[PDB]
Amino acid sequence: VNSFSGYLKLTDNVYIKNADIVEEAKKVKPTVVVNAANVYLKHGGGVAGALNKATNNAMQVESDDYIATNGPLKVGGSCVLSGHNLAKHCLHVVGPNVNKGEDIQLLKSAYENFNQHEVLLAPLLSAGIFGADPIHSLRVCVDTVRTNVYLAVFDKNLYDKLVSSFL
Template sequence: MDACFRLRRVLVELREGDITEVEADAIVNAANSYLKHGGGVALAIVKKGGDIIQRESDEYVARNGPVPEGQVAVTSAGKLKARYVIHAVGPKFGDPLGDEKLFNAFKNSLIKADELGLKSIAFPAISTGVYGYPYERCAEVAVKVLLSVVGELRNIERIIFCLYGAEAYRSFLEVFGRELRGYTSSC
């Protein structure tokens, strides 16, 4: 069952599932700085979207160098339902600046999607896989980003958090329900 929140004119949706199946203008990949998509969300995206995503990622790094933590790069989405993949580089849990870098990864993804004129974007729980961020902490950072940035968005109308597995979904639902309790909406 999806949960939704209305922040100004933006609908924020929580859903459990596979981000490669989401219909959105862009999906966000939880990436590493070299955009090598060898595991987790990144591997699933390349497997489903095709090798073009890895080739474009390699070209991006060859031209621009590694993507710093908290920053993003954009490629096409290959065979995915999305038009773009926004590769957001999150931090490893335990980094003293981790929350700030995670905040920037979410924020810069939203800003880039908005700059591209996109109406919808889907996020995974960035940095919660091999980078070890607890789901609850990731959700708390994501809420802070939403509350600080949503008023600046000109094009984005729908933000989806597509969470892989019941534990991730429950954690995000608990945090979003608590922090956005006055913003609930029907989906």
């Protein structure tokens, strides 16, 4: 048993809710919140901008030190950093950005990072400003992640479409 509340169960291990991931993170304080990161960990907008804003820019400060030491992530890759006031840890995961021409096939690799964590609160990777079809992202999530994932979908119309179209 865990403290996630109000989720619809899609599969044995995937759950979904219409929620703002920032407010969900602040309420639950999960062990792991997933950020929709880019390779430079520049948290300017979308989920990343919102998570970073909620940390009063501490996520960005930590991220800039990470990049200065390690260089950029790979598309499809991840790193574990602090969750600040939102979670114990933040798993920064880079899904492909279709608006940059990045290979949508890398979305499966991106979701494989979730399997290193028993339970996660997460957005749909490559959705929103990353330009992929969220219905496809949900399908890849369900077919790739084997650990317990609680998906937060900000947009109510999209949430309803994801549920109603789920196979």
